[PDB]
Amino acid sequence: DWNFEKMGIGGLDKEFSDIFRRAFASRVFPPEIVEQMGCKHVKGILLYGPPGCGKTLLARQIGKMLNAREPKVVNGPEILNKYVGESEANIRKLFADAEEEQRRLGANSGLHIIIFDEIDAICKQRGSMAGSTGVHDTVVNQLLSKIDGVEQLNNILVIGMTNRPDLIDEALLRPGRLEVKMEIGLPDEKGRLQILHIHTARMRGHQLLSADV
Amino acid sequence: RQSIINPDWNFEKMGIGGLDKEFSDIFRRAFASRVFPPEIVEQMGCKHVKGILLYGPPGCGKTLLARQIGKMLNAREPKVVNGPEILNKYVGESEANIRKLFADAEEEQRRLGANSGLHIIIFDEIDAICKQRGSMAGSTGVHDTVVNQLLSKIDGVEQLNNILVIGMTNRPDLIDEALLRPGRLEVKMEIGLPDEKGRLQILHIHTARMRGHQLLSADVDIKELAVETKNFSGAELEGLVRAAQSTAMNRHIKASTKVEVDMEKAESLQVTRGDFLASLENDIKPAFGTNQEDYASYIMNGIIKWGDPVTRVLDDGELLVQQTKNSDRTPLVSVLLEGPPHSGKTALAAKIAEESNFPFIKICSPDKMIGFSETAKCQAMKKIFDDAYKSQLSCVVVDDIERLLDYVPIGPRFSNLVLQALLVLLKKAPPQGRKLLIIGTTSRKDVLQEMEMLNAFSTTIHVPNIATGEQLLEALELLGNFKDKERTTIAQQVKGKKVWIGIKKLLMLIEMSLQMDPEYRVRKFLALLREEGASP
Amino acid sequence: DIKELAVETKNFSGAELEGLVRAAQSTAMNRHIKASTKVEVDMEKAESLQVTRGDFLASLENDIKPAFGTNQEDYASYIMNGIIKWGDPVTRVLDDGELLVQQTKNSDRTPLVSVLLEGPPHSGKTALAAKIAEESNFPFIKICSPDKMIGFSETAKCQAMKKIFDDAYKSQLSCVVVDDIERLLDYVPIGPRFSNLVLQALLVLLKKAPPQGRKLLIIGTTSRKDVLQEMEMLNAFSTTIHVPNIATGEQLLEALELLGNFKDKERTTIAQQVKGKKVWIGIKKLLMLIEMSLQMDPEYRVRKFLALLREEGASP
Amino acid sequence: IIMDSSISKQALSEIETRHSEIIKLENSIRELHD
Ligand SMILES: Nc1ncnc2c1ncn2[C@@H]1O[C@H](COP(=O)(O)OP(=O)(O)OP(=O)(O)O)[C@@H](O)[C@H]1O
Ligand SMILES: Nc1ncnc2c1ncn2[C@@H]1O[C@H](COP(=O)(O)OP(=O)(O)OP(=O)(O)O)[C@@H](O)[C@H]1O
Ligand SMILES: Nc1ncnc2c1ncn2[C@@H]1O[C@H](COP(=O)(O)OP(=O)(O)O)[C@@H](O)[C@H]1O
Ligand SMILES: Nc1ncnc2c1ncn2[C@@H]1O[C@H](COP(=O)(O)OP(=O)(O)O)[C@@H](O)[C@H]1O
Ligand SMILES: [Mg+2]
Ligand SMILES: [Mg+2]
Ligand SMILES: [Mg+2]
Ligand SMILES: [Mg+2]
């Protein structure tokens, strides 16, 4: 029981058709045909644009749109400890449930969502030409080694929100990990009309808005 | 002898295409002595190799090859390390974790002697822990201890003969030197971009199940896809096929505000060429290939032929391209395009580059280096050229050389590191038999000649301005502006004089003279032209 | 033959030799196997396995590479298109180099000798130091070129040069090449500007005798002699050698004949219009005008070559 | 502005008779043996 009219979003009526054509299209078709096709589902999305334009809203709404289990949340720089080898434990703890479910059952586990906020904060470019950045290298490696690795996962999906698309490590933005990327820009007139309607509908309901407005 | 190889393993089952030579080499050097009868090996008295390393650009098939080779051998299961997964905070616990990997082989050797089974160990992302033994100054020191433990356990006082270690990395220059001698890690391989046959084999491999169930329409032709995509890695091909399938499936599904599926279209499901072309145009974008956006921001308003001097530049560019494509003894040729300012010399370079059909084309322009220091500019240029060195052909454009050096007439002043990193990069030949071509643009030739930078460049082409009034009339006619009697009067006032104006300035004078009423456009145009035409 | 392998391998350590032997064994063994859809090993030809010398050379040239000193790849990279003989001025340089290298091995009063090759640009100096270094058959040979130090600051260049020179004090006798000096210590006519630390390091390293009883030979190349003379550096080098350009029609004809281009009638056609004047062109440019010319139709070839040569016309 | 730190722990000489079994010793001495 869900329709877009109850989502609460207004204006991003075209930047949502794609995200429901490349990320979820292969989980609603009859399973037998998809199995006969032998394809693998996408496991990443990246949203970017100016600040304060409706990004986190899409995250919550997409998270609760599916029957998926309740989203986890990593709050950017909340995974930086001080002892040696403590950030990696925090990173690894996210995929424990996914791995356990993938091992127990097979091709039947429910979708697991991991909402990643301020991706640019930690996932900086690894760099080269001698010199060690510090702890960022280890975190980046431990992250790149889990989404795609010797052991295969097919019941996960990662969402990343940031406003600087050209400060993220290039090895992370390749087909197979964080493939689909979208831009959410300022809205034109119709967007403003829909936004105002959505935000004033409640008051208009109870005859609390004068007819002069 | 129970064959180390699994009783049933055929190369067709592995599913790897385009890596035949590398796999043959690996099998020959790391598996040959375990399949030959044992008595002759005992007589010869040799010790088996115990190391393999893989490196290359991301997304070319390293972890696939490692996993498949690990699965080939029917002897136990691999022991994986997922990166920096062996690390703790208590003193002296990383070394214990490292030591727990080799324990089983140590125990088994003594019990069984010389009939043990191969024990494999995979070291995904090796460059996270093993680095130069003393290049990390300031840390607690776990790196040095880990490196020493690994070195002392692979080849120490006691000897093992039933292990095999595989490593993967993207930067095969930070790894320790003492770990890459003929004792520990011998066979080192590079996984590079495939050629036409590799792409054909990969596309055959991936789109096979769909062929089995008649889910692929006969309209599709594989050879066209193989030829049409150049410098695509395997992951990009997989993404292309997946995007095509996704579009085909989404075609049938109906409605988004209320999910609905129609079985009538579902039963008859097929993918056609149109989906493939749409996916190629819109979704997938290679990294080592050519992009269609670089040529839409520089050559903005097409190229018109206002006279004779326009065709000569293109012809000479074609001649240079042909020279660099079909000859040896000359694998690196460069050319300099120069002329007065506002003449249109940054569009001709782009057009010449685009008309070459080279797989790899790149433009290095100062638009993307605002505020950078000297070192940042040097690093950026070095990275561009390093990427260019990884293809069979290439073409690199250097735009507005005088702005890279940071020149200024007063003083004068400029950067020196950039000048040298540019002067020594115009004579370094590419590795092996790989070609290259460099096209530079400038507007002040004398200053460059005074810097002794005219020896590096192998030739020079001159881009002239509009000189004869007839050329101006031709340009005005071709641009689609004042015509009929208006044209006539302009001619009457222009033929009896000389004109000296660039082509980028005419497009601005015309547009500036069109904002008046429809009675004074000609007069304003002539006044502006007279005020601007300082014939030198 | 064991002695051939002993002589060929240079700067090998024991592990390297063991690896070479093992690789040769594996290559010899691989013939019997048939890595078809199923792995098969022949049991008839087996027991007749024999290791041949060709296998040893193949393993040497494909699957083993030492890590102390230069290797054939660098030599093939620098001296690229061979060393032709366009006249007498080619043999003189090699003879002088031979005399110098002979001196730096049978004497003890002078355990350090330095020489400098000078001439006009695009004349073939970096491909005559390599040949002299190679023909000496010294145990340790290293080349210090500035294309491996792109973007380095002054200190990094100093450290790299110091390390390369320290690697040469732990051998019995060695040769070191410093090519393109004018680019090691950045120089640009405007100003002038340059690095001072590099100049001081070089000027102190060129007069530092090695430990007791060991010898060294330094060969340096440059293109602008006068600037070096003006830095008070040209009284530190022991001697000097001059590398000239093609300066006569007969030498141009000889070079064209030996390179293998413009044969038969076209050669006489060129001779007609070339014998009536003198020429001034280096040997590296002459290998580029030829390639530029050989791109037109089967006809209209000599015309373009002569035109390009005429345009590139100057003199001292 | 960064410094990763390692730690070292120590065990405790857990004693069964340092409390609640000194009372049990009394229950064994003053009561059971009495
Ligand atoms: N025949 C032509 N040749 C070149 N450019 C042309 C021609 N016809 C039209 N143009 C347009 O003229 C402009 C060419 O000059 P451009 O805008 O690239 O600047 P430029 O020559 O690099 O200038 P600057 O020297 O000031 O950096 C482009 O808009 C190009 O579309
Ligand atoms: N007799 C010869 N002597 C030297 N080089 C020759 C001779 N014959 C052919 N060559 C070729 O000439 C080239 C050597 O010239 P090289 O590029 O080293 O000149 P250079 O003076 O060092 O240049 P620059 O100062 O511009 O860097 C090589 O291709 C070599 O094959
Ligand atoms: N497309 C939209 N339609 C309706 N409201 C929006 C939209 N985009 C943003 N908003 C409003 O912005 C507020 C906060 O947005 P927020 O999630 O903070 O965006 P961001 O995370 O990009 O700053 C929400 O309360 C919401 O009402
Ligand atoms: N030679 C190949 N043959 C077939 N598929 C390949 C080949 N190389 C890469 N691929 C495909 O592309 C992907 C490569 O990713 P992978 O190699 O696992 O990552 P990485 O390159 O970082 O090791 C795989 O999913 C595989 O399907
Ligand atoms: Mg937010
Ligand atoms: Mg991988
Ligand atoms: Mg320009
Ligand atoms: Mg030189």
Author numbering:
A (entry chain B): 212 to 424
B (entry chain C): 205 to 740
C (entry chain D): 425 to 740
D (entry chain H): 181 to 214
Quote the paper.
The membrane-anchored SNARE (soluble N-ethylmaleimide-sensitive factor acceptor protein receptor) proteins provide the energy to drive membrane fusion in various cellular contexts, such as intracellular trafficking and exocytosis. Supercomplexes of NSF, α-SNAP, and either a syntaxin tetramer or one of two binary complexes of syntaxin—SNAP-25 reveal atomic details of SNARE processing and show how sequential ATP hydrolysis drives disassembly. Six NSF protomers come together to form the active form of the enzyme, a homo-hexamer.
A representative 22bin20S model (class #19, 3.56 Å) and ɑ-SNAP—2:2 binary SNARE subcomplex model (class #23, 4.14 Å). A Hexameric NSF engages the ɑ-SNAP—2:2 binary SNARE subcomplex via N-domains (salmon), which engage three ɑ-SNAP molecules (gold) surrounding the soluble, 2:2 binary SNARE complex composed of two syntaxin H3 domains (dark red) and two SNAP-25 SN1 domains contributed by two separate full-length SNAP-25 molecules (green). The D2 ring of NSF (purple) shows no substrate density. B NSF (light blue) engages one of the two syntaxin molecules (dark red) in the 2:2 binary SNARE complex via pore loop interactions involving Y294 (protomers A–F, indicated). Of the five 22bin20S classes with the 2:2 binary SNARE complex, all are found with syntaxin in the D1 pore, while two are observed with the N-terminus of the SNAP-25 SN1 domain in the pore. Substrate-bound reconstructions reveal a flattened D1 ring in closer proximity to the D2 ring and a strikingly different ɑ-SNAP—SNARE spire structure than observed in the 21bin20S complex under non-hydrolyzing conditions. Even without further processing, this structure was recognizable as a parallel 2:2 syntaxin—SNAP-25 sub-complex formed by two syntaxin H3 SNARE domains and two SNAP-25 SN1 SNARE domains; this binary 2:2 configuration was previously observed in crystal structures of syntaxin-1 H3 and SNAP-25 SN1 domains and was unexpected as we prepared the complex with full-length proteins, implying that two independent SNAP-25 molecules contribute their SN1 SNARE domains to this complex. Unlike the non-hydrolyzing 21bin20S reconstructions, hydrolyzing 22bin20S reconstructions are only ATP+Mg2+-bound and substrate engaged in protomer E, consistent with a sequential hydrolysis mechanism (middle column).
